Amino acid sequence: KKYRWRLAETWGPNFPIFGDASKNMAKMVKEMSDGRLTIRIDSANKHKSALGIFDFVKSGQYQMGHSASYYWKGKDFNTMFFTTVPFGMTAPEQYAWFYYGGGMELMKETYDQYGILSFPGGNTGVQMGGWFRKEINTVEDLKGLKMRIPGFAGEVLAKLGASPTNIPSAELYTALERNTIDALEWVGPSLDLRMGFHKIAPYYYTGWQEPATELQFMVNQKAYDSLPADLQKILTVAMKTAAYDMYSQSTHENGVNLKALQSEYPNVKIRTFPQPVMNAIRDANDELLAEFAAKDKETAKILKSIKTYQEQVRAWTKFADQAYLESFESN
């Protein structure tokens, strides 16, 4: 008659934006449910397994998790494509895909076999390319590069001879400080500056690899089923709402912090990969997508949905948003 659930999240405690999304979700559920369902959150400082969230929720040890789908590529490579993909969709496009273009259904197709329900957990919007010790001037500079980079982008850089890793949010600055890694990408101005990377890595590259990173709420299938229908709805709605508000917050904080970056950080050197490097990355991505499609029918089905939907909705984005933003004045 009264439910007490626990949520495990990848992030350190009191982590802004990402931790706000899980917090906001839990507060809404309590408030809408007059306390019938309440959700206590354990961050990485507590459960000490930032990348164990999938297992926590699969087993039922936590009813819920907040994390990112593409962290679970080991469990199932198809988990990569429900977060974001290189050269993929923007957040408005991707939210359309999830809720109106078949994405939610495809995600369930992957996650049902684990007894996990996955839901969008909040979008960062467009991400940066990351923080580097040394500039990337040629493809050869990626060879043996120790870079923290998750998801399919990680796969792509491995294909080009890099040495990618997935170090979780709270340990990133330390890994770079000790030279465990020599480059990293995290998110963008909204979180990267308070996390301190610029102190060690002067070069801040523009992105390509995460155009709209969607985080993930995960729910144990049995816990969800243990709920009455009205609370089930409160839960799913609160997650969707928290996810959307996080994109709003990320956009807000990116505005605040790009501004700080263009005035309070004279030693940050904003850079873009040279075109020959982008062409090489683009080709490796396209080739690797083909490989992944050819080797599994479900992978092939997801990538075809992503590609097809992007082609349709991007034409509108180009026609509308992009043209609006590119508009100028002569004279």
Q: Which amino acid is at 138?
A: T
> Is 278 one of the binding residues for its own copies (CB under 8 A)?
yes
Integer angstrom CA distances of residue 305 from 84, 88, 110, 245, 287: 13, 12, 14, 26, 17
Count of residues touching Na ion (by CB under 5 A):
1
- Work out which of 282, 301, 305, 307 binds its own copies, going by CB under 8 A: 282
Tokens of 45: 């400082």
x-or-dash pattern for its own copies, window 306-325, by CB under 8 A? Answer: ---x--xx-xxxxxxxxxxx
Per the CB < 8 A criterion, the answer to whether 12 and 49 are in contact is: no
User: Which residues, 107 to 146, sit near its own copies by CB under 8 A?
Assistant: 125-126, 128
> Is 192 one of the binding residues for its own copies (CB under 8 A)?
no
Closer of 47 and 148 to Na ion (Cβ): 148
DSSP bridge pairs for 3: 37
Tokens of 106: 């495809």
> Which of its own copies, Na ion, none is residue 267 near (CB under 5 to 8 Å by kind)?
none
Closest residue by Cα to residue 117 from 58, 176, 178, 197:
58
> Which of Na ion, its own copies, none is residue 173 near (CB under 5 to 8 Å by kind)?
none
> Is 327 one of the binding residues for its own copies (CB under 8 A)?
yes
Stretch that binds its own copies, among 142-150, 171-179, 213-221, 236-244 (CB under 8 A): 236-244
DSSP helix/strand/coil, 106: helix
> Which of Na ion, its own copies, none is residue 198 near (CB under 5 to 8 Å by kind)?
none
Tokens of 174: 């330390």
Residues 6+ apart with CB under 8 A from 319: none
User: Which residues, 49 to 108, sit near its own copies by CB under 8 A?
Assistant: 87, 90-93, 95-96, 98-101
> Is 248 one of the binding residues for its own copies (CB under 8 A)?
yes
53, exposed or middle or buried, with CB in 10 Å at 0-12, 13-18, 19+?
buried
Tokens of 115: 């007894």
Closest-by-Cβ residue to Na ion is 210
DSSP 8-state secondary structure symbol assigned to residue 126 = S
Least distance (Å) from Na ion to the CB of residue 4?
33
Rounded Cα gap, residues 40 and 46, in angstroms: 12
Closer of 5 and 72 to its own copies (Cβ): 5
Least distance (Å) from Na ion to the CB of residue 316?
17
- Work out which of 51, 158, 237, 288 binds its own copies, going by CB under 8 A: 237
> Is 196 one of the binding residues for its own copies (CB under 8 A)?
no
Largest Cα separation within the chain, whole Å, is 70
- Other C-beta atoms closer than 10 Å to the C-beta of 153 total 27
x-or-dash pattern for Na ion, window 182-211, by CB under 5 A? Answer: ----------------------------x-
- State the residues that interact with Na ion by CB under 5 A: 210
